[PDB]
Amino acid sequence: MNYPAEPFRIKSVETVSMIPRDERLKKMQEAGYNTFLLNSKDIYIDLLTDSGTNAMSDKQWAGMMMGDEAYAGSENFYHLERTVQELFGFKHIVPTHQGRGAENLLSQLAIKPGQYVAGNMYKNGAVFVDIVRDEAHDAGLNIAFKGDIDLKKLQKLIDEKGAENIAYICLAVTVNLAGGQPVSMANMRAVRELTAAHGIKVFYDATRCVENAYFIKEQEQGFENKSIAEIVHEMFSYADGCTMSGKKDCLVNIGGFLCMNDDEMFSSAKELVVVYEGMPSYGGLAGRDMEAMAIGLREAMQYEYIEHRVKQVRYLGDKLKAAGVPIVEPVGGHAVFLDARRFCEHLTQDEFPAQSLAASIYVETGVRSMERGIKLETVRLTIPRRVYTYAHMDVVADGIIKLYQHKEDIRGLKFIYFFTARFDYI
Amino acid sequence: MNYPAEPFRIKSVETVSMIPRDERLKKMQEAGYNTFLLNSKDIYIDLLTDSGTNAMSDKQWAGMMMGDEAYAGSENFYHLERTVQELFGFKHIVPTHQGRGAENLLSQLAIKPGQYVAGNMYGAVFVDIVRDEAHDAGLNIAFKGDIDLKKLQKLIDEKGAENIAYICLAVTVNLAGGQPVSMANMRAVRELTAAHGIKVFYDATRCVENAYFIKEQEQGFENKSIAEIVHEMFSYADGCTMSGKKDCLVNIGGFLCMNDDEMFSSAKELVVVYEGMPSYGGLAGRDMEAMAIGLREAMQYEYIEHRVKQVRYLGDKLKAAGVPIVEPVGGHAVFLDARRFCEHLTQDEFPAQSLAASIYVETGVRSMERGIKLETVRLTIPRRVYTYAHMDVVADGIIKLYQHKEDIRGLKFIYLRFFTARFDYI
Amino acid sequence: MNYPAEPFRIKSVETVSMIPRDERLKKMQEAGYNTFLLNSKDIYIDLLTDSGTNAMSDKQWAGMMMGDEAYAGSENFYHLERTVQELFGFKHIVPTHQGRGAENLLSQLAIKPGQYVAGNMYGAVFVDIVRDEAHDAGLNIAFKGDIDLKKLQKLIDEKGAENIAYICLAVTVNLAGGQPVSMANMRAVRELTAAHGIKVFYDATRCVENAYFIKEQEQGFENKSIAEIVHEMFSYADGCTMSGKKDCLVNIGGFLCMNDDEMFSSAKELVVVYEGMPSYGGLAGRDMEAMAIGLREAMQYEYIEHRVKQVRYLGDKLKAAGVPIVEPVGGHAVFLDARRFCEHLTQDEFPAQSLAASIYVETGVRSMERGIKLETVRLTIPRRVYTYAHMDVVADGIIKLYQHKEDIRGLKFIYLRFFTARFDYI
Amino acid sequence: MNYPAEPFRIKSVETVSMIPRDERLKKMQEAGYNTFLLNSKDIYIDLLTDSGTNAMSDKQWAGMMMGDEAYAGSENFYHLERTVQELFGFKHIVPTHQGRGAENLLSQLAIKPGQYVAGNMYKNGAVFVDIVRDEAHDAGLNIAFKGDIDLKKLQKLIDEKGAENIAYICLAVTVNLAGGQPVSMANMRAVRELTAAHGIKVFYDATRCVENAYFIKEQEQGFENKSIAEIVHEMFSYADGCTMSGKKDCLVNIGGFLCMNDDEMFSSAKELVVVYEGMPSYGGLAGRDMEAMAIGLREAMQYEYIEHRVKQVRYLGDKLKAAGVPIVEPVGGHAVFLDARRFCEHLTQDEFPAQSLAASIYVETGVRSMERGIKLETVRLTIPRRVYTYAHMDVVADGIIKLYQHKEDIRGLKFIYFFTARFDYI
């Protein structure tokens, strides 16, 4: 139909308690109506985040059994190095345990104090200039590649601040607003030409780059018949490097990396490792983990894997939408946001409608959701890769639909004291 | 709807090729239109058997990392013995590498030459005492697996009390893809047999699937646990033999359980007389551990309700579309009626094999032609491996083929004759 | 010195209790001075058998994570078939769950009732054609396992050519803990037998251990690879049966290999006639993968030289201290002469059992009383599990006991009678 | 004897290539005589560092199979939290992926610019005052607990800078100089009293705290009969918290943690996580890794495990020492340093004697060592936990002894261009 069956079989499961409502209420009480303080063993479906809770393949698990734990010269590192080179086309790679990690070196490495960094990604040394196209900012409405950079604004910045004062342009693919919005291959190539004209560097935040690639393949004219791998290799052809949190699109539970083409930039990058470590290593990334990341990255290239990933989120969004549930449109490639203000018009900001909606979803279904501030009150439903089925999406949708039909019953809360905050029903 | 979402999350996946129709046709041609000859790597969904392709949990995998491989006094053996004692309520257990190994140990311990054996599912003479309806495939009757008490009485009477080794009760019984045996039938058989001092041994291979049926259908058990039903089932038996490969959620193993102290000693000597030293009959410590853990997981109501209903979901969708299926749907398989499906073909024009071949080409699903005699195509479902979406791939494929039954060409031999036979279209 | 350091690093360990002498005595008492009755958790070093307690490599563990558990067309089966074809040079392979399962499949395929079988290691009549020295335990002669060609000729002659099923060659032969068979003996036996059209099947269980001996002792093989020796060994046979649990570095599995096309078909039908469907005879896909990988690892010269020399190291230290041992030392075990050790006791006062009991109390090492008849204590060594330091714990313990042989009290029964027997001091 | 056999069995191995000398020379050439540029697959024994290459138990590996990957409320985190609380007696724990990580928060958390930090551990905001006792600084000579803080110097600092200007006292146990030197329980308790008298905080660098505990148990009067666990719990009773790199003494490949008792300090610590992450998590530490760390920490408490750890290093040191090899005394608990200046008096600093010694050790034995600057030229031999045997220590010793006896042959090198530095033989 519109929704493809999973392009894999289950190799192993994680059993669940399957605690009833009365029990879920107790737990919810004890967590003080704060979903973020719920124990993992008490949740059926955990949609808190799409970061690090991916299900790995049996291939990745075989790879975890072959960790070459040398401090240096690890064969797992060559594996990863070769994979990134081949798929992303970047010369050098500096592995980190976190994306944040990769992000730090680059900044250190590429920003002189009082220089500018601009990007589509909405303060130390640098000033960030949000250069996204203005209807990126928008909700409800649809412009396909909402995260595209506004070339007039980029050109303008260049004009009035000088190319010399621009550290680099940072383009996130996909950009993480409204559940991840795509960037066109057309805009990536335009950006490369304008910037290159002024000797400006371009770094991508490649975290959900496979998600981006699917959007391109699916909706950008001329890419209909290209491989995800072909799209991925071309996207990166327009950047000087990238930073990646492998915990998202690499189908791993940990890892990140910093990539570049620049010899010099590279050299220096290793130095900073040395200054921060004393000895250059794998940024405290086990050999087994580099191996699993290398295998996961290639697995991410299967079209059926990413099509199914995106449409599962799509499916939840659709189901919610066609029942009248107040959701934020357009639906991203990795999360669905409930509109808490519309959901609970009866409660005011002061009675924490999102917080309270999150609590009810859990009491009714065994589903954990995250309260938001995206500044509208949204309850986020973020979906990890390969962990859940459509039947699991049905559990989530059905319960929210029934909640919605009784929205009036959702009671407000009071701070009987945040990720630490404890509350009580007013 | 009527069907529960999986009571588990996916911990790891097995990646699949997802080869297109064009390559499937070719592989089919190459396999000689014999699905038994297809390679595992070329199969999307493999419904050939429910035996041994079960997905283990992460707890089962943690057990696999801790096998105590001592030849004697293994911690794993103790865990397995405890577990079975507690849930089956059998005093003694003889681990084996296969169901079939436990059986032949029983047959060689409990039968005197020329003695009869009587049961619901098929030296020695085999007497079939299952009620007559067991034999009617189109008839939707509950607990079709029940033994005919009168047929028992007749056997008892004409041959006498010790001309009978024992009575063999298979739960569920493997005709029509697992038909249950009511507890009432089990309490009955015991009674009649214990009076004459006769022995009853159960084939516990799909005993949890049977338990689910009793709890779901046998007026009186609605509020009894799966563990409570199981425990009582075996209170009406002298022992059982179990193939772990089925309801224990493991890929290998079985065991022989008895209550009789003597028989146990005889049994044990018979292992020392086959091996040299008493063993765990070619069962690794890691395997006894995973099997112990799996028996326990098999007892969660939500697990088994989900298991049986996923099968029923497949059955219902076929049923409601007019696809001729065996009834009632069993606990682990759905059988298509190939004769009625392909009325245009002849036993001679091999309707089952051709049906099975077309199914594969159309969907990437492997089924095996069968007979239970009746000419069927068996869709056997492994535990915790597939989803509802996977059931749909299977269901939609068969329905489209059904809507063109007439287009299914017949086959001829172009050469046991089952597992190796090659065919060509007519 | 004379003994190589391990050709491997430790990837993971198995933790041990390290219980003191006082608690060991008690456990011994509780086990009734029967080491067979000790619990695995109470043992420091377990030298009961070399069968199945082998340590697998991380490559073998990566294989275990990738079992393709399809009932037919498993990728694992293909890997295993390739591997054996290539190294053993046998055309066909029938996987089995045990060595013993492969054997009985052979015996039931290659023997006609009343036929004799002849070999070096012990319906049907068993003729022992090994040279007479094989039988002298105190005699240090090389290649003690060789078949007496004249004894063969005599058997051939008095009973005639087809009154003989086949000739059974065990390499190494399991008397004196693994005595080798020279290639020359193997080329000879073939010759004589192929003339009369007679069949030779090898018991390849410890075939790599045999290869090491040939390469080390048989003038001519010094520069031939372990793989080259192995390959040629099996060029003199019709097939073999192998217990994977020994030289394949796995905890379970075996196989039947033949060259004969017909026999293979018969064999295969005999699995379909025991199972219903041709199987992998209760061998998981993960297991065929680990066994394939293990055969290959068994071929590294450094692995097997280390294996055999670690055993020899134990032998040398006993030897040089005056401890009465069986000679020459075999490829996988050292046997103490209990009669000579404990000259003060009588067959009646159970010298072996008491020796084995004292060893345990003193060192935390489990050995088993044996007979090969001669009354010994067998110290069997698993592959890649222990170190030289572990050999020392064993060696020093026995030497201290030796220096007080006289203090070893005799035992009596306070009750097969082997595996369950309980004793008390005299 | 003086050297205990390993208090464990091998569960799995990592196979090695076992490349010969001529091949090792080539590799050495290609690495440009820089051991730090050697591939892991080409090394037999890798003594580069004692950081992160520990062999985990089968218990830890079972624990890696049970990773609860929730972003929050992970059961693995409770596991670890409970273990640290029980063993170290600290209230709160903030897990990190690296020790360095833990180190960073504390600094941020506990140092006001221009405050002092003093410790036994030889510049941002703070001034470090080395307060070790002066014969800590020493080589050759022996004072048992060489890392003890000089109380007169601590008192003096307090006197002239003011208690208010001291951020905290940092005590590393063991201190990492000369391969790790111990601190007395007597000195830890003295420090707590003096500091506490002035309201000064004390933080320990607990990285090799189990190593420390052994030294105390072994050489500090009154601890002879205390448990390692009893010693460990008491050491921590004298500190406000600690930072730990679990990669050392926790027998893991990754992880660290920051511990404290202070409610407030704790609260704030979480905030910093939030400022650096956005959401409080496990400092980017997988659930499987926290689980493995929890189990490893407890395993570290086995006396026989740590005694054997320390004496293995001791054994190498001893063997080297009794042959006349120039080593740095006293021998630490985790490494042996070769004196390169004395080893190669024929080469000058300018011809990089350490660098060149490291290269020769590798060419001759297949052993990788690290060039040092500890400012004497030393070649470091650092030993990972549970990976190597005494036979492996013999390989290392024997080769260095023969090198030593030919020291004159070691040729100097020239920079034909550091951890990146390539050289050539002059």
UniProtKB/Swiss-Prot annotation, chains B, C:
Keyword Lyase: yes
Cofactor(s) for this UniProt protein: pyridoxal 5'-phosphate
Biological process annotations from GO: tyrosine metabolic process
Enzyme Commission code: 4.1.99.2
Record PTM N6-(pyridoxal phosphate)lysine, positions in chain: 246
Top-rank EC class of the record's enzyme: lyase
Cross-referenced Gene3D superfamilies: Aspartate Aminotransferase, domain 1, Type I PLP-dependent aspartate aminotransferase-like (Major domain)
InterPro entries hit by this protein: ArAA_b-elim_lyase/Thr_aldolase, Beta-eliminating_lyase, PyrdxlP-dep_Trfase, PyrdxlP-dep_Trfase_major, PyrdxlP-dep_Trfase_small, Tryptophanase_CS, Tyr_phenol_ly
GO terms for MF: tyrosine phenol-lyase activity
Domain of life: Bacteria
Keywords attached to this entry: Lyase, Pyridoxal phosphate
Swiss-Prot/TrEMBL catalytic activity: L-tyrosine + H2O = phenol + pyruvate + NH4(+)
Family the UniProt entry places it in: Belongs to the beta-eliminating lyase family.
Quaternary state and interactors: Homotetramer.
Entry protein name: Tyrosine phenol-lyase
Source species: Citrobacter intermedius
